[PDB]
Design a protein around this ligand. Structure first.
Ligand SMILES: O=C[C@H](O)CO
Ligand SMILES: O=C[C@H](O)CO
Lengths: 231, 187, 72, 72
């Protein structure tokens, strides 16, 4: 039995800015392989870095001020007000620093997922805004790769029982071993699982959609291919 | 939540401050050691802080997107790293409780009555008040192993057709039954 | 020196920023892609920063009270 | 023509405005008081207005349908 389907990325993530600024450098090769947590961009941190330190200086000051008054009020050398106001400022500073720190951190646009980044929709030197609609880039885990197969709800059961009645080659709980046949006609050398748990159902058709998972090193398989699973 | 968490704490700091200010100034005006203005203003700020904090708290909370129902989630319409907006048109994902599963049956208003009386006249196998036991037959032809209730209380009526729609309830562990199947209930 | 040290770095951070700003705007003005009033201001900030830094540096330095003479 | 007449004057009002705006920004770029890009946007609007007015004028004129040929 041959089940028609489309290959899809195993995982998709969008790269976006979370701080305002100018793209200083784009540290990645379009179309290369990037790891999750890897810096993909550098937003000119000249200022954020400046504010952050400007802040810490402030906190260092107000903090001393406060700690000194805490001591003094205990001996009434100072009033309950002055200490209150002093500890007030101290708290505000401490807050500012934390916000400064957060923004500086967002200056290094990291990759959320491990996969394959394509073209960078943003040129170096460009202006980037937190909340902006468009994404700077898109990474894609392409190794284990999906193959979305759609069968009429009936067939999914039929297969499901053959799986339990040993009539199908086990591949794991709810998974049968399968082979892939490119629209090329050729036979993808490796083979993978065909999980039976449903992922979606077009109630307007009643048909179900399940996923096959093939190993894809060498990156021979790419999203969008019209293939055929085999049981 | 890096920031929401930051604003929330930034806020709580403030409240802690203004609250002290108030509770104190509430005592000085008490002995005319501070004008009515000074205290009114102090309690003003205090109330504002208290409000700010509550709003910060609410936003932080929404940071963790929970599932409203228990059931089966399908694909996630949103990728990680994506930008999400309150009020946005599209839903991030849809959960569907498929275990007890419904089977919408449509019979002409007449038939519904015919069956309703057989139910009362014991001519139909009771399954509960207003419910008769029923079996399911997939469009496959096969016979769904389990069986369930066929509630007679109407759910909707296409007045343009006069026909009524009632629901059958089948157990569906194993998740063999899925939405959209064209089946047949049997009595 | 906890603070002086902090102000001093707080400062240098600032200068590093305004300095970049200035050096860049001067390029723009040369293409008339920014009013010289914008540049003037940019270089104005740069000079203030540069001044701040120097004063910061001076104060930090005075943080280690040294002995003027050799003796007892 | 109640409206076409209104739109035509509504427009001319606009043009009179943006035109002044432009002519003034034109003296600024001359003294590097503004960027080329600014005088650009200003002159951009000015040209759009001038176009709008001409279209308004044309339409108002057609409010008076005329005969293409001499005949019966
Ligand atoms: O931008 C999406 C792909 O990475 C490239 O073209
Ligand atoms: O929500 C059901 C499917 O997973 C998607 O669209």
């Amino acid at each position: 039995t041959e089940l028609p389907g489309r290959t899809n990325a195993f995982r998709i993530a969008e790269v976006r800015p979370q701080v305002n600024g100018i793209i200083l450098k784009r540290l990645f090769k379009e179309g290369s392989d990037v790891k999750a947590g890897q810096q993909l961009y550098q937003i000119d941190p000249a200022t954020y870095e400046a504010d952050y330190q400007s802040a810490q200086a402030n906190l260092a000051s107000t903090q001393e001020q406060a700690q000194r008054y805490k001591l003094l009020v205990a001996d009434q050398a100072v009033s309950k007000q002055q200490y209150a106001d002093a500890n007030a400022a101290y708290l505000q500073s401490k807050a500012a620093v934390e916000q400064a720190r957060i923004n500086l951190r967002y200056t290094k646009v990291l990759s959320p997922i491990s996969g394959r980044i394509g073209r960078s929709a943003v040129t170096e030197g460009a202006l980037v805004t937190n909340g902006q609609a468009n994404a700077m880039a898109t990474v894609q885990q392409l190794d284990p790769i999906y193959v979305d197969v759609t069968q009429p709800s009936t067939a999914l059961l039929r297969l499901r029982r053959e799986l339990a009645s040993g009539q199908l080659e086990r591949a794991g709980d709810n998974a049968a071993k399968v082979s892939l046949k490119l629209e090329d006609g050729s036979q993808y050398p490796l083979e993978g699982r065909l999980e039976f748990s449903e992922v979606s159902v077009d109630e307007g058709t009643g048909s179900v959609t399940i996923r096959a998972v093939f190993p894809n090193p060498n990156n021979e398989l790419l999203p969008g291919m019209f293939v055929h699973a085999q049981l």
